[PDB]
Design an enzyme around this catalytic site. Structure first.
Site, mmCIF file in Angstrom:
data_model
loop_
_atom_site.group_PDB
_atom_site.id
_atom_site.type_symbol
_atom_site.label_atom_id
_atom_site.label_comp_id
_atom_site.label_asym_id
_atom_site.label_seq_id
_atom_site.Cartn_x
_atom_site.Cartn_y
_atom_site.Cartn_z
ATOM 1 N N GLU A 141 -9.325 -5.735 -3.318
ATOM 2 C CA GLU A 141 -8.679 -4.811 -2.756
ATOM 3 C C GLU A 141 -9.698 -3.646 -2.087
ATOM 4 O O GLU A 141 -9.346 -3.258 -0.852
ATOM 5 C CB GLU A 141 -7.920 -3.861 -3.900
ATOM 6 C CG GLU A 141 -6.523 -4.582 -4.286
ATOM 7 C CD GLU A 141 -5.446 -4.582 -3.291
ATOM 8 O OE1 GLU A 141 -5.505 -4.126 -2.281
ATOM 9 O OE2 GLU A 141 -4.501 -5.229 -3.748
ATOM 10 N N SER A 191 0.783 -1.265 -0.152
ATOM 11 C CA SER A 191 0.046 -0.025 -0.153
ATOM 12 C C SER A 191 0.854 1.159 0.007
ATOM 13 O O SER A 191 1.615 1.485 -0.854
ATOM 14 C CB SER A 191 -0.973 0.010 1.150
ATOM 15 O OG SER A 191 -2.092 0.865 0.758
ATOM 16 N N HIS A 220 -7.436 -6.213 0.761
ATOM 17 C CA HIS A 220 -6.521 -5.529 1.043
ATOM 18 C C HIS A 220 -5.572 -6.064 2.130
ATOM 19 O O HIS A 220 -6.069 -5.981 3.391
ATOM 20 C CB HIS A 220 -6.868 -4.035 1.121
ATOM 21 C CG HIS A 220 -5.979 -3.047 1.086
ATOM 22 N ND1 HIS A 220 -4.969 -2.806 -0.152
ATOM 23 C CD2 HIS A 220 -5.309 -2.195 2.021
ATOM 24 C CE1 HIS A 220 -4.305 -1.894 0.322
ATOM 25 N NE2 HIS A 220 -4.246 -1.650 1.520
#
Ligand SMILES: *[C@@H]1O[C@H](CO[C@H]2O[C@@H](C)[C@@H](O)[C@@H](O)[C@@H]2O)[C@@H](O[C@@H]2O[C@H](CO)[C@@H](O)[C@H](O)[C@H]2NC(C)=O)[C@H](O)[C@H]1NC(C)=O
Ligand SMILES: *[C@@H]1O[C@H](CO[C@H]2O[C@@H](C)[C@@H](O)[C@@H](O)[C@@H]2O)[C@@H](O[C@@H]2O[C@H](CO)[C@@H](O)[C@H](O)[C@H]2NC(C)=O)[C@H](O)[C@H]1NC(C)=O
Ligand SMILES: *[C@@H]1O[C@H](CO[C@H]2O[C@@H](C)[C@@H](O)[C@@H](O)[C@@H]2O)[C@@H](O[C@@H]2O[C@H](CO)[C@@H](O)[C@H](O)[C@H]2NC(C)=O)[C@H](O)[C@H]1NC(C)=O
Ligand SMILES: *[C@@H]1O[C@H](CO[C@H]2O[C@@H](C)[C@@H](O)[C@@H](O)[C@@H]2O)[C@@H](O[C@@H]2O[C@H](CO)[C@@H](O)[C@H](O)[C@H]2NC(C)=O)[C@H](O)[C@H]1NC(C)=O
Ligand SMILES: N=C(OCc1cc[n+](Cc2ccccc2)cc1)C(Cl)(Cl)Cl
Ligand SMILES: *[C@@H]1O[C@H](CO)[C@@H](O)[C@H](O)[C@H]1NC(C)=O
Ligand SMILES: *[C@@H]1O[C@H](CO)[C@@H](O)[C@H](O)[C@H]1NC(C)=O
Ligand SMILES: *[C@@H]1O[C@H](CO)[C@@H](O)[C@H](O)[C@H]1NC(C)=O
Ligand SMILES: *[C@@H]1O[C@H](CO)[C@@H](O)[C@H](O)[C@H]1NC(C)=O
Ligand SMILES: *[C@@H]1O[C@H](CO)[C@@H](O)[C@H](O)[C@H]1NC(C)=O
Ligand SMILES: *[C@@H]1O[C@H](CO)[C@@H](O)[C@H](O)[C@H]1NC(C)=O
Ligand SMILES: *[C@@H]1O[C@H](CO)[C@@H](O)[C@H](O)[C@H]1NC(C)=O
Ligand SMILES: [Br-]
Ligand SMILES: [Ca+2]
Ligand SMILES: [Ca+2]
Ligand SMILES: [Ca+2]
Ligand SMILES: [Ca+2]
Ligand SMILES: [Ca+2]
Ligand SMILES: [Cl-]
Ligand SMILES: [Cl-]
Ligand SMILES: [Cl-]
Ligand SMILES: [Cl-]
Ligand SMILES: [Cl-]
Ligand SMILES: [Cl-]
Ligand SMILES: [Cl-]
Ligand SMILES: [Cl-]
Ligand SMILES: [Cl-]
Ligand SMILES: [Cl-]
Ligand SMILES: [Cl-]
Ligand code: NA
Ligand code: NA
Ligand code: NA
Ligand code: NA
Lengths: 527, 176, 352
Positions: free
Chosen positions: C148, C21, C261
């Site tokens: 995600e 990320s 995610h």
């Protein structure tokens, strides 16, 4: 108070407000010994060094030169005239840096045009503060010697070796290499740019081995060394030097005695006699220009170009739609900035005499023949426009295109532009169109100043050009990547793609002036 | 847009508005007038013609594409309407070759050239004018997409006519 | 690491950055920063890259937010240095408590204070640097997870909950777009709706729920990662792209949230190799393989597992755009991940 320690001593600059921001300007930093007394006609000597602080807070003296007095009171001509005192003591440069001080900014170095006879870095249209403010590049410009004082040649003789003004430029580039990191600049990211003779100068730096390590890449606006006005032959250079000696009463037998006699003459006497060293001048007469000196230039530059002997790097090259028009009112019969200049066939022919003095009758006929088969209506402005295109193609466009083809054949990326926008503020008449020299103000971002009465479209065009130039200097690729702009393709000798620069539709085109340039480049040199 | 796109959703009309109304950039008063003309022209004529030509040429056949840019000196319609639908026809049929008809000399020359290119195309499958140092007409391929401009002055080879607009009409709009 | 790691038995000439990320965005920025060029060898970017819309703050925003923070803390001054000096006397809690409100409308993905073009670490707008090939020339490994966007929906989107199946209506979907696209025009929101709501075709009730997850995922993570990889590879460097499709057997989040995610990380770090931790046997095998591919990438610039008849990982080129799927069953080579969706986000949407 912004003081920068250079290798030669401290310099004080001044703060400028630009676009709700700040730019720091250092105007008139010396970069060589004043070339006075026994130093006249000699190569520039290194600077002595000083304690105390040099005040770089105003433009310095411009180099000695003849002034255009053809249109007194007219802004169209007078804007090119020097705006500081003329002096031999004129070897100075200017630096514009972003505020706050950048950490490792790309450097753009401007070299003015003026046919190697005139010009100064202090002109309004060369003000680097906008580029500094908007793109956060550092902008450098220098005065260099012009006319006889800068290019008088007596080949092999160090008292007057030729190319002095080019060595002036070179010493300035050196100054940037040694000092610019102190101003927050990156000496490894230096891009030269110049217009006309300035552009020819740039192209010559690409050819001079002494300039190889002093810059990264190059931008050539309306000029290149292979233009017919750009390089003086050795034969001419000596005939002109001797003619100047004759006019000044400095004729001797010993060639060094001549130069010594010329060294006692007042600059005015030299300047006043420069015009007559040639029996027949043209409006584009370069009486004292670059020569093959065996120092700056090791060989005839056409040979170096042809055989790949130059700095391998990226170039950006371009020309304006009506290069030739400006020169027609400085001699050509029937022409005037104050009427539509409708000329007859006979006036056109006389015009060729003016622009092609030493050319055979057959040679003049062949120009006439190539440019006078109309398509096909008998418009009265037929000959007027033809003569403009003749002068433009021969002196500027075709040489620029040939330079670009030859340079790109050795594997380097090149980008070619065709500037097609006529300034809304142009003081010259409409028939003169998109004139020689009138892209400069767009490159320097004058129309970004919303006060200056340029149109909105012109602001947009200038902003885009400024970005493309900056990206070229920083990254070697003149793209504008953010605003769905037309991608600028490389120029190859095959497809020969070029980009049009205008206020409306930006386009990719091929083979600019194909027909005309075949005439000038292949046939005409034989004549 | 309501008039020209009756059964289209509000969103569909908006997307046309969006694509054709980001000016470059001066607020010229003829902005919307010209945009609507281009909308109607691109949607109904230009983009379909270009798509047809690409698709047809992908199967190996030679194709030639032209862009007609000359406004008749005798046009009774107003100037704002420009180079109108249907006003190339008289040039193809060679009306301006009649020196009585009050067309200009340039128009006679253009018509003569068009007539020759059409005839050569019909006779030989190749719309060249070979005798008068004319610009050579390259084939249209779905890649380079070269086309020839037809005008009274400079005849030119160009690429990818209305690239931006036609992507909108051909790809996006049919989904709407 | 450059100055000290040889003392630990390490090789300063073989350093691979990896992050997830914002960590991955950071990695991508190190590829762009000249000061970081000599400090590493290559890079691994998991679910992130600088060109993601949450990753870089504009200069306009950065100043408005700094000034808003000053206002909230009573540190508004005229001199900008006085502001910072006033902020320097504030207790960290007062700063932290006011960070949320420097923005009028935040999203669940709000990055109030992030990277900016400072003229030091970042010399120019990073999209320009990427486009024009101004970055460290080396190998990259880039990838994303199948779902995600789902994790972010329970942090604001109406009708969503980790404690039910989160079946939302059309109207809830529309409100959801408002939350995730605050400053976007009505037309812009409509165009998202239009692209993600032409079902194929059964009127399954989880239709809008999944669409909103894909919207948030594609816009914020997948399409930017794919664009970064294409642009980077166009300048001649080998790149490898993965699509992580395995949902942890130990996932505490509900089934509808899918392959979330951040939940590839534990596989990269080899947690399931610990047979005590109650991961399945298949998960141990997958982690072992991922760990080997990552290590081989770091050591040799090539993320192959060469010993166990594993599927060979082909380079990602902007043409064929091959990528490798990572899962507990069939590992496959596929092409053009989310082709339709990414054309929408990358070409059209930025104009909006
Ligand atoms: C190189 O030398 C002479 C230049 O003679 C010049 O004398 C200078 C002081 C100056 O006044 C200049 O105007 C003058 O031309 C060139 O020969 C000239 O050509 C004319 C042609 O009418 C002859 O009459 C003379 O020999 C001479 N000029 C005059 C009137 O005295 C010579 O051609 C030149 N070489 C070139 C230009 O190729
Ligand atoms: C456009 O002007 C030229 C230039 O000379 C004239 O400029 C005018 C504006 C006016 O001030 C006049 O007094 C000045 O002489 C004209 O060319 C001139 O034409 C006359 C005869 O008509 C000749 O005797 C001159 O030699 C000639 N000058 C030059 C430089 O050759 C020209 O006629 C005019 N064209 C028009 C009106 O369209
Ligand atoms: C940049 O500045 C202002 C931010 O104003 C802010 O004041 C902060 C202390 C904080 O309380 C924050 O929530 C507040 O928004 C932005 O203008 C805001 O927009 C609203 C819209 O209703 C207006 O009412 C105000 O001008 C202002 N907020 C309020 C309620 O005072 C401005 O838009 C922003 N720039 C951006 C985000 O583009
Ligand atoms: C799934 O849950 C959401 C979230 O809110 C609820 O969570 C439940 C698990 C329960 O604890 C409840 O008390 C809590 O409010 C539900 O959305 C809510 O729906 C109600 C009316 O039905 C609205 O008044 C709330 O505004 C709304 N909350 C949010 C965040 O918008 C949702 O209905 C539920 N869906 C199901 C049961 O499938
Ligand atoms: N051509 C010259 O003198 C005539 C001359 C003198 C001054 N100018 C400046 C100028 C530039 C562009 C448009 C209008 C005016 C042009 C031509 C040389 Cl370069 Cl000094 Cl040889
Ligand atoms: C340099 O400029 C400043 C302007 O304030 C002045 O104080 C200083 O004396 C100057 N030095 C000179 C003129 O040598
Ligand atoms: C600026 O960049 C050059 C390479 O272009 C680098 O070598 C140099 O260290 C940099 N100068 C700085 C940031 O001091
Ligand atoms: C020319 O004059 C210079 C200076 O007086 C002198 O050095 C040189 O000997 C002279 N050259 C010749 C060969 O006459
Ligand atoms: C890009 O477009 C915006 C307006 O949409 C404008 O403000 C900006 O100046 C443009 N940038 C360049 C470099 O042309
Ligand atoms: C070719 O040119 C001549 C004039 O030079 C003209 O008479 C003839 O009509 C032209 N032919 C065509 C087909 O255009
Ligand atoms: C801002 O305050 C600092 C610290 O007192 C001072 O150095 C500076 O002069 C001030 N700047 C301006 C221009 O007010
Ligand atoms: C290769 O396969 C064997 C079992 O046949 C296994 O023990 C080993 O962990 C595998 N290696 C990797 C790196 O997956
Ligand atoms: Br000039
Ligand atoms: Ca032209
Ligand atoms: Ca454009
Ligand atoms: Ca033609
Ligand atoms: Ca999937
Ligand atoms: Ca496998
Ligand atoms: Cl002396
Ligand atoms: Cl360099
Ligand atoms: Cl004749
Ligand atoms: Cl190159
Ligand atoms: Cl071509
Ligand atoms: Cl065929
Ligand atoms: Cl093209
Ligand atoms: Cl390294
Ligand atoms: Cl609806
Ligand atoms: Cl590689
Ligand atoms: Cl495929
Ligand atoms: Na003087
Ligand atoms: Na000459
Ligand atoms: Na943000
Ligand atoms: Na704390």
């Amino acid at each position: 108070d912004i003081i920068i320690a250079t290798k030669n001593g401290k310099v004080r600059g001044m703060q400028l407000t630009v676009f709700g921001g700040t730019v720091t300007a250092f105007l008139g930093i010396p970069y060589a010994q004043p070339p006075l007394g026994r130093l006249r006609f000699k190569k520039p000597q290194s600077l002595t060094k000083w304690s105390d602080i040099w005040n770089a807070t105003k433009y310095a003296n411009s180099c000695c030169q003849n002034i255009d007095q053809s249109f007194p009171g007219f802004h169209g001509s007078e804007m090119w005239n020097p705006n500081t005192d003329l002096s031999e003591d004129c070897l100075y440069l200017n630096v514009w840096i972003p505020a706050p001080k950048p950490k490792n900014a790309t450097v753009l170095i401007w070299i003015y045009g003026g046919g190697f006879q005139t010009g100064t870095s202090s002109l309004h249209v060369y003000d680097g503060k906008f580029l500094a403010r908007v793109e956060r590049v550092i902008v450098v410009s220098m005065n260099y010697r012009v006319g006889a004082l800068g290019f008088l040649a007596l080949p092999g003789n160090p008292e007057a070796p030729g190319n002095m003004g080019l060595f002036d430029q070179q010493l300035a580039l050196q100054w940037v290499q040694k000092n610019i990191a102190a101003f927050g600049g990156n000496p490894k990211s230096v891009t030269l740019f110049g217009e006309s003779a300035g552009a020819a100068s740039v192209s010559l730096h690409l050819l001079s081995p002494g300039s190889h390590s002093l810059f990264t890449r190059a931008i050539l606006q309306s000029g290149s060394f292979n233009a017919p006005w750009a390089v003086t032959s050795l034969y001419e250079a000596r005939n002109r030097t001797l003619n100047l000696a004759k006019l000044t009463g400095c004729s001797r037998e010993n060639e060094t005695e001549i130069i010594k006699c010329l060294r006692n003459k007042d600059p005015q006497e030299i300047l006043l006699n420069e015009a007559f060293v040639v029996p027949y001048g043209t409006p584009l007469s370069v009486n004292f220009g670059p020569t093959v000196d065996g120092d700056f230039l090791t060989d005839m530059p056409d040979i170096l170009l042809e055989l790949g002997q130059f700095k391998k790097t990226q170039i950006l090259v371009g020309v304006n739609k009506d290069e030739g028009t400006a020169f027609l009112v400085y001699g050509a019969p029937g022409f005037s900035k104050d009427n539509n200049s409708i000329i007859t066939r006979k006036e056109f022919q006389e015009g060729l005499k003016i622009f092609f003095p030493g050319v055979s009758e057959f040679g003049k006929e062949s120009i006439l023949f190539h440019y006078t088969d109309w398509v096909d209506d008998q418009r009265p402005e037929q000959y007027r426009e033809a003569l403009g295109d003749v002068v433009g193609d021969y002196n500027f466009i075709c040489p620029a295109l040939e330079f670009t083809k030859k340079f790109s054949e050795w594997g380097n990326n090149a980008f070619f532009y065709y500037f097609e926008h006529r300034s809304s503020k142009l003081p010259w008449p409409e028939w003169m169109g998109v004139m020689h020299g009138y892209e400069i103000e767009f490159v320097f971002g004058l129309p970004l100043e919303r006060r200056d009465q340029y149109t909105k479209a012109e602001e947009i065009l200038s902003r885009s050009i400024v970005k493309r130039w900056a990206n070229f200097a920083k990254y070697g690729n003149p793209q504008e990547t953010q605003n769905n702009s037309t991608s600028w393709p490389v120029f190859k000798s095959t497809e020969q793609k070029y980009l049009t620069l205008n206020t409306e539709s930006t386009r990719i085109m091929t083979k600019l002036r194909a027909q005309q340039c075949r005439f000038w480049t292949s046939f005409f040199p034989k004549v």
